[PDB]
Amino acid sequence: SNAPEPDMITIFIGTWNMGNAPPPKKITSWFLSKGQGKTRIPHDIYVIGTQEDPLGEKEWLELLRHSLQEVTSMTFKTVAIHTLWNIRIVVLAKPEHENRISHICTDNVKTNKGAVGVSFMFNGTSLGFVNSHLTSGSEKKLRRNQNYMNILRFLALGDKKLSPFNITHRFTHLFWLGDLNYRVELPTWEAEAIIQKIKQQQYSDLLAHDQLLLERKDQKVFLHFEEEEITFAPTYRFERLTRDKYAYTKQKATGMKYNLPSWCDRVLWKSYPLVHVVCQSYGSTSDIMTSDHSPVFATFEAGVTSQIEFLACYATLKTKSQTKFYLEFHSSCLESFVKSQEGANAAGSEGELVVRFGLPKLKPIISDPEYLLDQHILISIKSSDSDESYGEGCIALRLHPIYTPLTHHGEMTGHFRGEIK
């Protein structure tokens, strides 16, 4: 008898800045999650992002497929490969999944730096993957933040019918990896102390100065993304062919400069509310030494799948606009997206607008509760004057009151609250 489709899959994410050098003949440690770092069987999907990648596409594919044969005893199939400059993403999957995978998309954004991405459906679940190489230099964190903002706005992945939504709402699970280039922000006179803290494996004191964690805390990038705790050493910048020494100085015509050891190479994720996702490993290798960066691995278990009445809903927006607003509801469980009538505007606290709705009844294509309880509704609040979104969010149907933050262009713009039946 036909077995039920999987309710969970496992996903390997790798990111490696290859430093423009060919890889060594053995890279299996990367796929085995062998190295320092948090931990909680071949994976269903392998996503391999490289930067400063010097190889051709078919050359690198054959090295990966052979390495995975040795690790898993299976021959993985190519789902997608996409390259911009020397920034590349490869997605491989078990052969048994080939008929489960549909709507494969690829795209890139130039910001040489930039991003590549791949998205596809696994049965009923959308998955997105972004590999970005962001602006380099300890002093350029604001430019990295802007690179992130431009990638999220302009990378075209996922269902194009989801017109008001960027990649941060288009997927049940979105994974963002790469050489994000954020540095440990400490004075250069502290270099030798940092090296000592690394040898003592005292990472929490250095992570207090990691620009990516600090910019996330201030809501400047990666809003509502998670990252596993980091318990591996900084992955940059090593002398090549060893891992025993960091190369933290750099000669320049204008005098010696510094690249203090940093966690440049990262994996983050954002999943729809109430969907299962758990990180099983996050770490770096120590035996792959052809680059001045070490490869990073992160593995995950992720949940997948095979009338709706919105009641007493209001939005709060930080805006001075006096337009009226309406709502748009989008979901794979609807035959097409649904627009509401205009709400009623009132002032809230300073600079804020409350938009109250006293809303169309949504009719899902399938009414089976085993189907519906796993669905989500994407919500956009749009200006009637311009038809542009002022805020996007997501509600789980897994049953009540409902709530989502609203963002636009990846930054907070307000909140949406109500009840659902």
Swiss-Prot record:
Function summary: Phosphatidylinositol (PtdIns) phosphatase that specifically hydrolyzes the 5-phosphate of phosphatidylinositol-3,4,5-trisphosphate (PtdIns(3,4,5)P3) to produce PtdIns(3,4)P2, thereby negatively regulating the PI3K (phosphoinositide 3-kinase) pathways. Also able to hydrolyze the 5-phosphate of phosphatidylinositol-4,5-bisphosphate (PtdIns(4,5)P3) and inositol 1,3,4,5-tetrakisphosphate. Acts as a negative regulator of B-cell antigen receptor signaling.
Organism in which the protein naturally occurs: Mus musculus (Mouse)
Induction behaviour: By activin/TGF-beta (at protein level). Regulated by the Smad pathway. Isoform 3 is expressed during myeloid development.
Subunit structure, interactors included: Interacts with tyrosine phosphorylated form of SHC1. Interacts with tyrosine phosphorylated form of DOK1. Interacts with tyrosine phosphorylated form of DOK3. Interacts with tyrosine phosphorylated form of SLAMF1/CD150. Interacts with PTPN11/SHP-2 in response to IL-3. Interacts with receptor EPOR. Interacts with receptors MS4A2/FCER1B and FCER1G. Interacts with receptors FCGR2B and FCGR3. Interacts with receptor FCGR2A, leading to regulate gene expression during the phagocytic process. Interacts with GRB2. Interacts with PLCG1. Interacts with tyrosine kinases SRC and TEC. Interacts with CRKL.
Protein name (database record): Phosphatidylinositol 3,4,5-trisphosphate 5-phosphatase 1
Protein family per UniProt: Belongs to the inositol 1,4,5-trisphosphate 5-phosphatase family.
Effect of disrupting the coding gene: Mice are viable and fertile. They however fail to thrive and only 40% survive by 14 weeks of age. Mortality is associated with extensive consolidation of the lungs resulting from infiltration by myeloid cells. Increased numbers of granulocyte-macrophage progenitors are observed in both the bone marrow and spleen. Absence of Inpp5d leads to steel factor-induced degranulation of mast cells. They also display increased numbers of osteoclast precursors leading to a severe osteoporosis.
Expression sites by tissue: Specifically expressed in immune and hematopoietic cells. Levels vary considerably within this compartment. Lost during erythropoiesis when erythroid cells become Ter119+. Increases substantially with T-cell maturation and when resting B-cells are activated. Also present in mature granulocytes, monocyte/macrophages, mast cells and platelets. Isoform 5 is the only form expressed in embryonic stem (ES) cells and is coexpressed with other isoforms in hematopoietic stem cells, and disappears with differentiation.
Full-sequence portion shown in this chain: 402 to 855 of 1191
Cellular localization per UniProt: Cytoplasm; Cell membrane; Membrane raft; Cytoplasm, Cytoskeleton
Domain comment as written in the entry: The SH2 domain interacts with tyrosine phosphorylated forms of proteins such as SHC1 or PTPN11/SHP-2. It competes with that of GRB2 for binding to phosphorylated SHC1 to inhibit the Ras pathway. It is also required for tyrosine phosphorylation.
Post-translational modifications reported in the UniProt record: Tyrosine phosphorylated by the members of the SRC family after exposure to a diverse array of extracellular stimuli such as cytokines, growth factors, antibodies, chemokines, integrin ligands and hypertonic and oxidative stress. Phosphorylated upon IgG receptor FCGR2B-binding.
